[PDB]
Amino acid sequence: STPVRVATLDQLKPGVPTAFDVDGDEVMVVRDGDSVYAISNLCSHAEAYLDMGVFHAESLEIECPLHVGRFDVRTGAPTALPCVLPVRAYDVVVDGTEILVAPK
Ligand code: FES
Numbered sequence: 732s733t734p735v736r737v738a739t740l741d742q743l744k745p746g747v748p749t750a751f752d753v754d755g756d757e758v759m760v761v762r763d764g765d766s767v768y769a770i771s772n773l774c775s776h777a778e779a780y781l782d783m784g785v786f787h788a789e790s791l792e793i794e795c796p797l798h799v800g801r802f803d804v805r806t807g808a809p810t811a812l813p814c815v816l817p818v819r820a821y822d823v824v825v826d827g828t829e830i831l832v833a834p835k
Pocket residue numbers: 774775776777778779795796797798799800801812813814
């Protein structure tokens with residue numbers, strides 16, 4: 732009603748974060764195994780774009796490229812300084828190989 736289709740699951744390399752426009756909001760999407768996670772692409776610490784940082788599959792953290800703060804991709808929770816405030820997490824469903832993200 733309606734979500735945003737960003738990509739097909741296998742168009743995403745596992746562990747490689749990308750960003751998509753979801754109804755005006757920029758959203759970082761990343762595959763781990765067969766799971767897909769989505770959070771705001773904008774770091775809460777200062778202006779930086781999380782998809783251009785480093786994804787840590789073992790801990791499910793995205794590391795900001797600018798001051799290397801971290802967020803949990805499952806929840807948007809800040810998990811390493813200097814990030815101290817969470818970013819928005821987006822609900823994601825994979826349906827028939829299509830990755831669908833619920834808009835804000
Ligand atoms: S802008 Fe992301 S840690 Fe500073």
